Design a protein around this nucleic acid. Structure first.
Ligand SMILES: [K+]
Ligand SMILES: [K+]
Ligand SMILES: [K+]
Ligand SMILES: [K+]
Ligand SMILES: [K+]
Ligand SMILES: [Mg+2]
Ligand SMILES: [Mg+2]
Ligand SMILES: [Mg+2]
Ligand SMILES: [Mg+2]
Ligand SMILES: [Mg+2]
Ligand SMILES: [Mg+2]
Ligand SMILES: [Mg+2]
Ligand SMILES: [Mg+2]
Ligand SMILES: [Mg+2]
Ligand SMILES: [Mg+2]
Ligand SMILES: [Mg+2]
Ligand SMILES: [Mg+2]
Ligand SMILES: [Mg+2]
Ligand SMILES: [Mg+2]
Ligand SMILES: [Mg+2]
Ligand SMILES: [Mg+2]
Ligand SMILES: [Mg+2]
Ligand SMILES: [Mg+2]
Ligand SMILES: [Mg+2]
Ligand SMILES: [Mg+2]
Ligand SMILES: [Mg+2]
Ligand SMILES: [Mg+2]
Ligand SMILES: [Mg+2]
Ligand SMILES: [Mg+2]
Ligand SMILES: [Mg+2]
Ligand SMILES: [Mg+2]
Ligand SMILES: [Mg+2]
Ligand SMILES: [Mg+2]
Ligand SMILES: [Mg+2]
Ligand SMILES: [Mg+2]
Ligand SMILES: [Mg+2]
Ligand SMILES: [Mg+2]
Ligand SMILES: [Mg+2]
Ligand SMILES: [Mg+2]
Ligand SMILES: [Mg+2]
Ligand SMILES: [Mg+2]
Ligand SMILES: [Mg+2]
Ligand SMILES: [Mg+2]
Ligand SMILES: [Mg+2]
Ligand SMILES: [Mg+2]
Ligand SMILES: [Mg+2]
Ligand SMILES: [Mg+2]
Ligand SMILES: [Mg+2]
Ligand SMILES: [Mg+2]
Ligand SMILES: [Mg+2]
Ligand SMILES: [Mg+2]
Ligand SMILES: [Mg+2]
Ligand SMILES: [Mg+2]
Ligand SMILES: [Mg+2]
Ligand SMILES: [Mg+2]
Ligand SMILES: [Mg+2]
Ligand SMILES: [Mg+2]
Ligand SMILES: [Mg+2]
Ligand SMILES: [Mg+2]
Ligand SMILES: [Mg+2]
Ligand SMILES: [Mg+2]
Ligand SMILES: [Mg+2]
Ligand SMILES: [Mg+2]
Ligand SMILES: [Mg+2]
Ligand SMILES: [Mg+2]
Ligand SMILES: [Mg+2]
Ligand SMILES: [Mg+2]
Ligand SMILES: [Mg+2]
Ligand SMILES: [Mg+2]
Ligand SMILES: [Mg+2]
Ligand SMILES: [Mg+2]
Ligand SMILES: [Mg+2]
Ligand SMILES: [Mg+2]
Ligand SMILES: [Mg+2]
Ligand SMILES: [Mg+2]
Ligand SMILES: [Mg+2]
Ligand SMILES: [Mg+2]
Ligand SMILES: [Mg+2]
Ligand SMILES: [Mg+2]
Ligand SMILES: [Mg+2]
Ligand SMILES: [Mg+2]
Ligand SMILES: [Mg+2]
Ligand SMILES: [Mg+2]
Ligand SMILES: [Mg+2]
Ligand SMILES: [Mg+2]
Ligand SMILES: [Mg+2]
Ligand SMILES: [Mg+2]
Ligand SMILES: [Mg+2]
Ligand SMILES: [Mg+2]
Ligand SMILES: [Mg+2]
Ligand SMILES: [Mg+2]
Ligand SMILES: [Mg+2]
Ligand SMILES: [Mg+2]
Ligand SMILES: [Mg+2]
Ligand SMILES: [Mg+2]
Ligand SMILES: [Mg+2]
Ligand SMILES: [Mg+2]
Ligand SMILES: [Mg+2]
Ligand SMILES: [Mg+2]
Ligand SMILES: [Mg+2]
Ligand SMILES: [Mg+2]
Ligand SMILES: [Mg+2]
Ligand SMILES: [Mg+2]
Ligand SMILES: [Mg+2]
Ligand SMILES: [Mg+2]
Ligand SMILES: [Mg+2]
Ligand SMILES: [Mg+2]
Ligand SMILES: [Mg+2]
Ligand SMILES: [Mg+2]
Ligand SMILES: [Mg+2]
Ligand SMILES: [Mg+2]
Ligand SMILES: [Mg+2]
Ligand SMILES: [Mg+2]
Ligand SMILES: [Mg+2]
Ligand SMILES: [Mg+2]
Ligand SMILES: [Mg+2]
Ligand SMILES: [Mg+2]
Ligand SMILES: [Mg+2]
Ligand SMILES: [Mg+2]
Ligand SMILES: [Mg+2]
Ligand SMILES: [Mg+2]
Ligand SMILES: [Mg+2]
Ligand SMILES: [Mg+2]
Lengths: 49, 78, 65
RNA sequence: GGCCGGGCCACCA
RNA sequence: UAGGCCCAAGCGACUGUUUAUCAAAAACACAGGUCUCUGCUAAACCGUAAGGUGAUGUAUAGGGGCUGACGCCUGCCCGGUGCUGGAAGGUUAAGAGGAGUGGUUGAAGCUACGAAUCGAAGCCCCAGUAAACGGCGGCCUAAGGUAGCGAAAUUCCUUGUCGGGUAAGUUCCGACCCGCACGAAAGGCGUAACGAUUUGGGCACUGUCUCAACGAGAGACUCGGUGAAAUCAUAGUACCUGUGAAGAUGCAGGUUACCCGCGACAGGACGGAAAGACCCCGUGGAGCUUUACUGUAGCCUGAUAUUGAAAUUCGGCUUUCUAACCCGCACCACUUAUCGUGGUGGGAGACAGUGUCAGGCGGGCAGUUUGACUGGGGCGGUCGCCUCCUAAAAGGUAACGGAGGCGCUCAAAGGUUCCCUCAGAAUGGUUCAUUCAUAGAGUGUAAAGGCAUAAGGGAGCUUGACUGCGAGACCUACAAGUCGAGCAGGGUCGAAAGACGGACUUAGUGAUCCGGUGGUUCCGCAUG
RNA sequence: GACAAUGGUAGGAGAGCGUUCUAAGGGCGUUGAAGCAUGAUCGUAAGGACAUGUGGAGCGCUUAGAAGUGAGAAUGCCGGUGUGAGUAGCGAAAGACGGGUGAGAAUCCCGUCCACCGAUUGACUAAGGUUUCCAGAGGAAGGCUCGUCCGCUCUGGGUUAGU
RNA sequence: GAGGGUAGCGGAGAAAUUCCAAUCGAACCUGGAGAUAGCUGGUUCUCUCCGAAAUAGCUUUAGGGCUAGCCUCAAGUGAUGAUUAUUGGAGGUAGAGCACUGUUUGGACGAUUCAGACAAACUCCGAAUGCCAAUAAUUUAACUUGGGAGUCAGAACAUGGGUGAUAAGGUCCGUGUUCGAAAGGGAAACAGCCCAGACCACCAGCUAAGGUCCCAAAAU
RNA sequence: UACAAGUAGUCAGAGCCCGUUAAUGGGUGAUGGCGUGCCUUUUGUAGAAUGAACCGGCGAGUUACGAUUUGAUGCAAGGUUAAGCAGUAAAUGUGGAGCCGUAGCGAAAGCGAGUCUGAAUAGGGCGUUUAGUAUUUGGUCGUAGACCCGAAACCAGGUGAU
RNA sequence: AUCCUGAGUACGACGGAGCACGUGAAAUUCCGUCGGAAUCUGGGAGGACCAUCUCCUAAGGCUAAAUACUCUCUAGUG
RNA sequence: ACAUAGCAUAUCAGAAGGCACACCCGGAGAACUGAAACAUCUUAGUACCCGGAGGAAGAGAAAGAAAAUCGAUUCCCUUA
């Protein structure tokens, strides 16, 4: 509340929307794959385990 | 009765914004004014509202021009 | 009980990596004949919520990460 | 704004 | 123990009624007058309804408004508002009526919408109505105040002026009319009688007074008994002049004063009592009003259901019918019953009533709103933006300080290249010429700052009054606002360097939410 | 050791005092705990001891934990007690004396005289109250004084309907 | 008189906002309920260090609030703080002047000219100061990021000004000090003036303003 | 202590009377200097502004759940469970669903140490070039009456015409 | 799949209500008024709507436990 | 007129009223308050009132959730 001055989150516009089908991925970088031995077969099950 | 007066506009904060001998970067405003009270000199530009601004990095120098006129230049620091 | 997010605020800002809030610009709805070309072009560019305003409104968006 | 020749009706940034 | 009386004026006719507990009155009522509604299941009123009051009444009756015995009377205005009646011309809702279109599946089809036109009251229009609301001039109107009264319960000026009354009369009485601002049923003017009414005068009479004295009793006072209260920071609590939050027991300097009672008095302790009723303030409350906003009880009107059969006439209109529905109609039974139910007649009848939907009216009732600044508040003025002065030679800087302007404009008054130079004066001529003329002209517009690099004037071409931006900087609480080199894309003008992202600069504007329109390699709820 | 700093409202920061309860450890107490009272005691403060009297059964200390944790003001709430003060008042009026009773008498009983009401201060019904009525005994409180008296206290009684 | 009836969004009223169980512009009781109170009052042990503000902007805002300003605590960063000297610069006040605008007095000549004046919104001129900077002396800050605030009634004095009347202990701005939040000495007394900033103790000393005949310390 | 002018004390001080937690002691006090209570509220109160007769007791920032920050501690590219079950109303064991972090940018599709805008191999915004997480003490905020007391009023359901 | 499989029903318009959701792109559920289906080649839903696909089979009824509370009772706790 | 309504008699002992009616289901349903005013909205389907019960009540055996499949209802955690 700003004492009756129009508050900041009313003087600014709304923007955008939310995608219902938004896909978010789990991310593994190359540096995190360095913990496996040479010749390993990397799989989501192995990354989770 | 009542006064017919009571009005004024917002003060516009004109005048010098950098000192003679001071180092400024390019784009720095040196002087706000109405008209050419001070003229643009060397490496100094004059904006649409008559603002004087430095076009290079360098040192501000206020100098006389002619008999009754002034100018401000900026010179590259060696 | 849980604190409640200010939903109006939540519709107008987004959190940045450093924890700041990216905001849209006022004066961008109508009356565009009265604002100059450069004014509108530069009003297309997003700003941040100022630190003075953050001091006032931070708790309203504590859950919006 | 609607309709008819100024009158009725309509108008929740 | 047992009326004081007389003269005169205002108000109200009268007896009566009223603020239990500061108002008894001129206020209310009243008999009388008038207007208006109401044909009986009356109107009006209470109640959601049933049921009631009205009334076991029936227009010589009942409700509501106004006036207020009686006497003489009650003028002008119907433009406005209300009320009443007309016209079904314009406008309008539900509903009907379906031309047509979008989405989807070449279509059906399903689906979202959708114009002809039919469609009530109201409102608009016309007329009337003033013992309806109201109005009763300063050429204007709807019309401009009749009778009577008038310095008044009304007259500001005002103690109007004159007369009477008194030695002396702002009151009183009688006149005048110059009625700030009387006036005819929110009645005018009178009026015998009446009045714990208001007002002026007089006789009687008096301790009301000159002017106070004495006497009786009850308290007070002394003694025995009994024995509270408000109040109270601690108190060994002086005055004067001063000081001080601007009126001192308590501070300063003086002055005065042995310690403790008792009877008295009220100048102070801003003495006690009641968180000032006045005044202001609170985005406090409550009651009341209305042509404040939004509603709503109710009522009016239309469609449709209940709800059926025939016709006539132009989807309607109209007429007839009976069998739904209705009867606070009659008789009959239950039943010794003015309820009810049933039966039979009569009346009425697809109306009414009631449900749902729709339009209208609706301070009758309800929830609320009705700004701030302000040398208290109100009234007046002001509220955003631009320029100047105040402003103290950076910037900034207040007052209901002193002055002005803005809510645009221009297709050139923008861009570029080329060229050009003013106002004024003097002197000559039935606008022109010469000479001076640093600008004393002009610059779209207010002022200031600038401008003869012209930023002022003219011409050619033109549209940079571009798209994507943007180092850095000014200003600044925020939101905003301002300036900007330079890079890229595509140009204009220029021989070229180069200039151009509107205008000599600084006003000419308004956030968000919502909605409309155009585009869109975005999303679009199993998939398209 | 030798230099500096240390006025302070709103307010920020730090360190401590004390109260009740809990855990663990270690103690005190009928050869007298807590509480209370007095004292010329100790600590920079909040505060801590000791001695003596009273009291008569619980209570410290250490470390840590938890709070209904600290009052002088709220026209604060409750209780007690002051002040005003031996002050105001003691609620419409005619009593006097004799005798009696008694610890005590203006005030109770009895007597005489006096005085007041008498369209009522008399008599009887109703409402309302509900034992206040009667007798004997009493005098703490109540009675605006007193009290031997009482509508007060104790004990025992009292209301009878065919009309 | 008795027995009954009308009940609070309501009754009743020969009407006064009048009565409805000793206060009726809407009775009383209980509940919602700890209504709400941007208002008043109150808010309890101690010491230690630091220590404000009474302003700006916006506000149905004006004795409220919000951000900024000023306080505190903690980490960072490190010359960026302060003062002076010197040097450079921006700007138009005081004064002065009349070159422009406006005002004004006396001559002269036939508007100009001679002489002499006036100005917040006049300037041919123009200080002192203050301000912005740059690189030596002294000095001790400064800034950034977070945790916690309070403040938004100010007052007098001096001085530059508006306003008022070259009135006000008036009012509104600029500048400085003090009070606020500051005791001590002086000004008789006396927040705001003068001297001066109290860690504690001392029956030591030197001074400030102000004083030295007695009150009453010190020069008759 | 009866010649004295006052917020009642304080500093100085004879006289008299006592004798202790034995301390450069205790009680009283002629006489002198200095000195207008406290609280609240204020620009400013001795204030003739508020509040308190006195004494005693009682009487006001609390707790729960979220957020943020600081300190502490465990683990660390990881940290941690919730309900539940077992257990003594315990600690604790088990429970990995879930949550936060290890990656951001964008309205989104998306792309990714980048990404968005943009025609751009340009410029610019936000990012990258490690540190988090769990519990808990303290501070503060939010939802709750939220430091305490106090309206006038509003609504609902009852009770009243002695 | 020869017959049966809940009819004034589902559903629709208007007015409302309940759904976190204020009529909105508002599906899904219920009430009043008025209208008003289909019949396994059927019907309903998958957030307007259409087509495909997917899931289901309304308009009849019954059902313990896990859950809520404490005037109580018994045994205990702080 | 048949009939029915009605009336008399015997038999049954079904209802009535109460509550801790705390929890539960339904009917009906505010206001102060918050929005720094206020009407939409909020307080809140809360308070109060009324009806019906049980030891629990309600719900319940898909014209469901979904989009790789699950398989009545309810309740706790989480999603958030
Ligand atoms: K008329
Ligand atoms: K008329
Ligand atoms: K006259
Ligand atoms: K008059
Ligand atoms: K007072
Ligand atoms: Mg200005
Ligand atoms: Mg321009
Ligand atoms: Mg737009
Ligand atoms: Mg009369
Ligand atoms: Mg009479
Ligand atoms: Mg009276
Ligand atoms: Mg009076
Ligand atoms: Mg009287
Ligand atoms: Mg009748
Ligand atoms: Mg009359
Ligand atoms: Mg009359
Ligand atoms: Mg007439
Ligand atoms: Mg007419
Ligand atoms: Mg119509
Ligand atoms: Mg119509
Ligand atoms: Mg007058
Ligand atoms: Mg006389
Ligand atoms: Mg006369
Ligand atoms: Mg009249
Ligand atoms: Mg009349
Ligand atoms: Mg007489
Ligand atoms: Mg006497
Ligand atoms: Mg006596
Ligand atoms: Mg003083
Ligand atoms: Mg004085
Ligand atoms: Mg005096
Ligand atoms: Mg004195
Ligand atoms: Mg006396
Ligand atoms: Mg007196
Ligand atoms: Mg008084
Ligand atoms: Mg008051
Ligand atoms: Mg008052
Ligand atoms: Mg007064
Ligand atoms: Mg109708
Ligand atoms: Mg009203
Ligand atoms: Mg209200
Ligand atoms: Mg005002
Ligand atoms: Mg005023
Ligand atoms: Mg006005
Ligand atoms: Mg200056
Ligand atoms: Mg300046
Ligand atoms: Mg103007
Ligand atoms: Mg204007
Ligand atoms: Mg030109
Ligand atoms: Mg140009
Ligand atoms: Mg779908
Ligand atoms: Mg789809
Ligand atoms: Mg200190
Ligand atoms: Mg000091
Ligand atoms: Mg603190
Ligand atoms: Mg501590
Ligand atoms: Mg302690
Ligand atoms: Mg104890
Ligand atoms: Mg306590
Ligand atoms: Mg007290
Ligand atoms: Mg007392
Ligand atoms: Mg006394
Ligand atoms: Mg006496
Ligand atoms: Mg006395
Ligand atoms: Mg006396
Ligand atoms: Mg006496
Ligand atoms: Mg007596
Ligand atoms: Mg007699
Ligand atoms: Mg007796
Ligand atoms: Mg006695
Ligand atoms: Mg007795
Ligand atoms: Mg009642
Ligand atoms: Mg009466
Ligand atoms: Mg009254
Ligand atoms: Mg009145
Ligand atoms: Mg009364
Ligand atoms: Mg409540
Ligand atoms: Mg309260
Ligand atoms: Mg300090
Ligand atoms: Mg101020
Ligand atoms: Mg506003
Ligand atoms: Mg001068
Ligand atoms: Mg002159
Ligand atoms: Mg002159
Ligand atoms: Mg000047
Ligand atoms: Mg002055
Ligand atoms: Mg002053
Ligand atoms: Mg000043
Ligand atoms: Mg100071
Ligand atoms: Mg001082
Ligand atoms: Mg002093
Ligand atoms: Mg002094
Ligand atoms: Mg003097
Ligand atoms: Mg002195
Ligand atoms: Mg003096
Ligand atoms: Mg000396
Ligand atoms: Mg002396
Ligand atoms: Mg001496
Ligand atoms: Mg003497
Ligand atoms: Mg003596
Ligand atoms: Mg004295
Ligand atoms: Mg003294
Ligand atoms: Mg203060
Ligand atoms: Mg004052
Ligand atoms: Mg005092
Ligand atoms: Mg006094
Ligand atoms: Mg007060
Ligand atoms: Mg008092
Ligand atoms: Mg007390
Ligand atoms: Mg709090
Ligand atoms: Mg805060
Ligand atoms: Mg079935
Ligand atoms: Mg709904
Ligand atoms: Mg729904
Ligand atoms: Mg929906
Ligand atoms: Mg459906
Ligand atoms: Mg039975
Ligand atoms: Mg039975
Ligand atoms: Mg029961
Ligand atoms: Mg029950
Ligand atoms: Mg509100
Ligand atoms: Mg019930
Ligand atoms: Mg029940």
């Amino acid at each position: 509340f700003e004492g009756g001055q129009l508050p900041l989150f009313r003087r600014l516009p709304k923007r955008g929307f939310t995608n219902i089908n938004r896909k978010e991925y789990a991310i593994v970088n190359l540096d995190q794959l360095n913990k496996f031995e040479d010749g390993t077969e990397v799989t989501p099950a192995l990354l989770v385990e | 009765s009542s006064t017919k007066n009571g009005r004024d506009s917002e003060s516009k904060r004109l005048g010098a914004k950098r000192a003679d001998g001071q180092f400024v970067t390019g784009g720095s405003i040196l002087y706000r004014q109405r008209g050419t009270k001070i003229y643009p000199g060397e490496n100094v530009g004059r904006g649409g509202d008559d603002t004087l601004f430095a076009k290079i990095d360098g040192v501000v120098k206020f100098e006389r021009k002619g008999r009754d006129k002034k100018q401000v230049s900026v010179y590259a620091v060696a | 009980p849980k604190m409640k997010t200010h939903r109006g605020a939540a519709k107008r800002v987004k959190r940045t990596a450093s924890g700041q809030l990216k905001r849209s610009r006022a004066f961008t709805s109508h009356l565009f004949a009265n604002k100059s070309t450069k004014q509108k072009r530069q009003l297309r560019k997003a700003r941040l919520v100022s630190k003075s305003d953050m001091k006032r409104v931070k708790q309203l968006l504590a859950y919006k990460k």
